Amino acid sequence: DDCAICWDSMQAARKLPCGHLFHNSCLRSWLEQDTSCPTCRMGSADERQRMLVQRKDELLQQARKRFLN
Amino acid sequence: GTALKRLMAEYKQLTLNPPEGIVAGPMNEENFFEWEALIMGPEDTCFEFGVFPAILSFPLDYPLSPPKMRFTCEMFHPNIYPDGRVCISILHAPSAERWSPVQSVEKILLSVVSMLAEPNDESGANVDASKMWRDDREQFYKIAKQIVQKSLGL
Numbered sequence: 001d002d003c004a005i006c007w008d009s010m011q012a013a014r015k016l017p018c019g020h021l022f023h024n025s026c027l028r029s030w031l032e033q034d035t036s037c038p039t040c041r042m043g044s045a046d047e048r049q050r051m052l053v054q055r056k057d058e059l060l061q062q063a064r065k066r067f068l069n
Numbered sequence: 070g071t072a073l074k075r076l077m078a079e080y081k082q083l084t085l086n087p088p089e090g091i092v093a094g095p096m097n098e099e100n101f102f103e104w105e106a107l108i109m110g111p112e113d114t115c116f117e118f119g120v121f122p123a124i125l126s127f128p129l130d131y132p133l134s135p136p137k138m139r140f141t142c143e144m145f146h147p148n149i150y151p152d153g154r155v156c157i158s159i160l161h162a163p164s165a166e167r168w169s170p171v172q173s174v175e176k177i178l179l180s181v182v183s184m185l186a187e188p189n190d191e192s193g194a195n196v197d198a199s200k201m202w203r204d205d206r207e208q209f210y211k212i213a214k215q216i217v218q219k220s221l222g223l
């Protein structure tokens with residue numbers, strides 16, 4: 001099941017020819033979709049929201065200035 | 070869930086070092102599956118200083134599948150549908166450069182800022198725009214200019 005110290009999945013890696021490697025469950029999920037190597041071929045939330053909203057209309061404002069020159 | 074974990078980590082990473090002219094994140098951290106991205110037309114490109122809002126709608130199984138990306142404003146561009154849906158290789162689910170779990174919101178946006186500067190002439194979300202981009206490059210530059218004006222509200 002899950003590691004008793006940290007409560008994470010503790011699951012085996014599978015390695016592939018090309019070198020790269022991944023969790024067994026993650027790789028399988030992908031194989032289900034495509035038979036290739038996924039890598040090659042084969043703090044308050046409110047403060048964050050406000051920063052993001054403010055950068056959006058600063059981008060706009062600044063765009064207007066560059067356009068009007 | 071994997072999707073939500075990836076998305077939270079991409080947003081944090083994204084925010085640390087945002088590429089010039091791109092602001093992207095969830096519209097509300099209560100739902101990381103729905104983001105807005107503002108992209109600015111790079112300078113000295115034909116969509117110069119345009120500011121284009123797009124919505125990214127992420128699938129439950131992300132990053133196994135791409136988000137849908139839809140520009141919310143008006144656009145005239147060979148790789149964008151009438152409704153605003155963006156159609157490029159990286160956004161298509163599984164000889165192009167399709168979606169793999171190793172892509173990211175960031176790489177999607179790099180790709181999209183790229184297509185604004187250098188269209189995929191032979192791809193037909195927008196036939197009219199494709200043709201003109203070749204035959205009447207001169208008009209296309211004019212239509213592009215009024216598309217910028219509009220995105221800016223002017």
Ligand SMILES: O=C([O-])C(=O)[O-]
Pocket residue numbers: 001002003004007
């Ligand atoms: O004890 C555990 O490992 C748990 O509850 O996940």
Ligand SMILES: O=C([O-])C(=O)[O-]
Pocket residue numbers: 012
């Ligand atoms: O449990 C397993 O699958 C292992 O150890 O490889």
Ligand SMILES: [Zn+2]
Pocket residue numbers: 022023026
């Ligand atoms: Zn994994």
Ligand SMILES: [Zn+2]
Pocket residue numbers: 016018019020037038039040041
């Ligand atoms: Zn590989």
